Amino acid sequence: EVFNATRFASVYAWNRKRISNCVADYSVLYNSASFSTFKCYGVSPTKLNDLCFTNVYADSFVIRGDEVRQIAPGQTGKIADYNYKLPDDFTGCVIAWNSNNLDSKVGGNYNYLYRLFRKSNLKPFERDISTEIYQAGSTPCNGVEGFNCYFPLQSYGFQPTNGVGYQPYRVVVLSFELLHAPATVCGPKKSTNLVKNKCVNFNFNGLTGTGVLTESNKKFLPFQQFGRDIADTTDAVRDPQTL
């Protein structure tokens, strides 16, 4: 649904979708050959099906070709300042693929807008849909376009076939949000039986490790998934299938 969305929004008023309550098989995403840029900040593009996440964000764009480099941590530039800000400690992937077919009409497809004037750079994931006229001088504008009074939005266009870095790149961005809470979106692993009192290599809801899983006497609260020790290491775990 998110990847094959009918139409996306422009970068300035970008659409955010919430993804949860499932299993997910990202390996098909990596094995597509349809994605010109598949770069991730922290993950192996592989092995991504061995993880568990609480909330998976899907942000998605109409940015320009030469611009894709800016959808990344630590970048600075036109979109990365007033249109979309990734945080420094971003934990996700940035999937880009030029859709010139979908939106590039002769005489240019102009549906897609971007803020060009802004007083201050955005905070991470901050979205600004303000349509106030930009006061670029010392005199008030009062919604009157003219000198030092410019509407802060502009239309990209994306000429049909004139884009080498001037083409629509629907940059979908996954932001992987984990509270060390109930993970909810994690990949197709077969939940084998459980073995007790024996050293095993376990993977509970994305929490990995090696140890001896024994019956406890601790009293967990209904909202708690796992205890911890003084060392910040895992101490007790709730079986996600058996309470």
Place this chain on the structure above:
Amino acid sequence: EVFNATRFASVYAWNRKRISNCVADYSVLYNSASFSTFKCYGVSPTKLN
């Protein structure tokens, strides 16, 4: 005068111009959209003023 100079010289004989004794407003240079590459090694382009 530097940026909108009439004619630049070639790289092997690159021209140098000395700029001093004024106030500088680099923000107009950053806010131009006419520069494909604006990379700064030490300044952020912002806060340069």
Place this chain on the structure above:
Amino acid sequence: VKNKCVNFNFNGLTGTGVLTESNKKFLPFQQFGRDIADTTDAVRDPQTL
């Protein structure tokens, strides 16, 4: 402003301290002084000598 903890910026030299009239005998060419720590010990104003 003198005799008060303020943040200050003289010609790009940024810091926090108390600006007081000093009795140091600067020479007419010396722009500012330093302490043993290679830290700014005194400045002379770009507007008022």
Place this chain on the structure above:
Amino acid sequence: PLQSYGFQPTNGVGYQPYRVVVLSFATVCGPKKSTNL
């Protein structure tokens, strides 16, 4: 599909046959420029 070249000694510079060797590039190292001990 293939045609032969009419190489003659009385032809011009461009029509003369030329022996061309292309050395496309571990077991094959360069020589040894050494000095006295």
Place this chain on the structure above:
Amino acid sequence: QSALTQPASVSGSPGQSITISCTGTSSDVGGYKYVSWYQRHPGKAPKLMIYDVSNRPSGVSNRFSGSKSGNTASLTISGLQAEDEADYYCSSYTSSSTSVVFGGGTQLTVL
């Protein structure tokens, strides 16, 4: 979208100023800064005076100005004459199926 809304006919007097309204959708005028107006001398070709809402080609008399707010574009004619009697059409780019929309038109009759 659909055809824009213009007054059916506006009258006035020479030298007096008359303004023409142009209402559309937020996807026709309110999302964009691309309003352009036109005029019909009867039996003749269009002629552009307005584009970039308040901007102008070279050679158009300073009597015609364009304005923008909300869903309303507007054209103002200062110092009217019988020279000015014509039909008037506002145009805009749209963020939808089509790309260009026009108003119904306005006949300015000089009395």
Place this chain on the structure above:
Amino acid sequence: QSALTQPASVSGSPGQSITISCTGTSSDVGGYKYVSWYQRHPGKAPKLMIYDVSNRPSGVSNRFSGSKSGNTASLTISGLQAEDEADYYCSSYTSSSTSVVFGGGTQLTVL
């Protein structure tokens, strides 16, 4: 720049060698290595036998050589014949408004 300087006419004898001068500006010949010479047989087309100052295209007899120093380019014809009687024009790229300049030309008359 302006048209290059070539001798009006040079005569000689068959088998003897004749050299042709070509003076320009430092922006015509002295800044570049791009001097080329051509010949006019009367009522015929040009022909390129000199380029890259001293370089030669395939098929040009080894009798014509080109040389370069300062503002002076020069063409030497060794072993002259009545076969060689023609007009000669030197050409060069220029670092100024234009891109190609030619000499006035030289008629080599074989006596």
Place this chain on the structure above:
Amino acid sequence: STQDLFLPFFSNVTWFHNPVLPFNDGVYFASTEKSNIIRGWIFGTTLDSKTQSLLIVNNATNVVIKVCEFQFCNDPFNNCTFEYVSFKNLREFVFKNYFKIYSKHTPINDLPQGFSALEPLVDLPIGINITRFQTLLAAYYVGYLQPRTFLLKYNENGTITDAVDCALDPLSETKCTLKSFTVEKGIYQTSNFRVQPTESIVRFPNITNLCPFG
């Protein structure tokens, strides 16, 4: 402590009483004048036109500095870029490379022994590539600057009162390391001794077993 181009201590200085002299890295000039015979300098490479040359002259009222492609005389006594108009007498100067000038003027009653510090007075951002210089006309002195280390002693007023030439002698090296002009009795590690290599040897094995290029 700092490093720059200074006059190494107790070095030879050429005593004159006209010709053109080298500018190797920076020239220290001193003069003892009674009648103010010396009037200026010339700096450059050829000191003849078809290149820019520094010219400094005091004509009786002011100091004029100019850098044209001058027509110099053989025995002096266009396309211009920069211009400016301003034995008892001991005048000292330091000329080094842009172009920077210091001086210190004192009276005296053949080079007086004693220490004084030189202060900067004029900046000339001309960027002339200088290798030769000649003094325009009494005795005057010329020595050459070198990249040496010094330990400068600022007094209460910021006045330089002493200095240590750091490589003048092993005693002066010790004063460098201890950052002091006084050294108590003892043994001090000052530097490191190191034999430098004499030549470069590049080797690869016997050249037998050649590929059959033939």
Place this chain on the structure above:
Amino acid sequence: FGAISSVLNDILSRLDPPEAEVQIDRLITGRLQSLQTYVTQQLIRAAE
């Protein structure tokens, strides 16, 4: 210590090698530097 995470398994279950060795290296230096400090603290305290 500037790592994206303080659990090395997360580094393993997150990263491919071509960026993992950089990230675990940032963890390796601080943690070793921590034990290094601790031993010296003990060594001095042991002498006490």
Place this chain on the structure above:
Amino acid sequence: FGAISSVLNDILSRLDPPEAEVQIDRLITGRLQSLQTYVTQQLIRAAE
């Protein structure tokens, strides 16, 4: 310490955070390690 400059107030007025973080980190790991060196000296010297 390999940072472009040794003044924190410069670096902050010189770089935006995503790049200044790298340079400041160079001072911190160095300057701390010097402070760490000094403390170890004092402990040993204080024992003397």
Place this chain on the structure above:
Amino acid sequence: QVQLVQSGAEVKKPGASVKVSCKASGYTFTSYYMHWVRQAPGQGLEWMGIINPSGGSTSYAQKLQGRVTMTRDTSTSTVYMELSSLRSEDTAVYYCARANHETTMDTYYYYYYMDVWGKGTTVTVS
């Protein structure tokens, strides 16, 4: 004298196909776009679609599927306008329109400025 000329008028009955030209003059034919606007009787002006003189890439209104194919000629600087399966409302005055910027690489200015025009060419279908 940058000016656009189509052919004369046509008289059609429904279901036919019609050929409308538009030659250009006074400029570089490969730079600007060619826009096309008609005028249905009593309702205002109406854009079909466009074609690029540089490559010939086409597009048109959804409401005009399969009933329009825009062709062109670079050698004679002539662009051609086709409308098949003709209906009564296809009676209109058909204009050829030029864009107010040259096709430019890595561009920003949008290419729908309708500023240069044909005389007009009315279609009659009944």
Place this chain on the structure above:
Amino acid sequence: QVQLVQSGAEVKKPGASVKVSCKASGYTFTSYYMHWVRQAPGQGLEWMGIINPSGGSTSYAQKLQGRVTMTRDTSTSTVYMELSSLRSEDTAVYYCARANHETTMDTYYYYYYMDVWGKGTTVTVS
């Protein structure tokens, strides 16, 4: 047989315009450039400007502002040469010239080698 053929001679009086096209043969018309050199009477040979068969981009000598517009035809491999506001010295022998390298991407070799030629085309203006 790579050979360039221009039109025949012309007889003009001042102020007119003249049409001198040059067809090509024996090669790929879209690769090389077309250079143009005249011969004023008594003074030597003189280049106008050129046009690229790939795109049609033009340029010419400053001394020849507005008098000259170079056009071409890819279909017939014919390139056309225009000179308006004709004057007496415009009497000259015009030759079409071909560049000694094919238009190549990211190239180094300069494209003013004048190596392939037309028979001629003398202009007479009085």
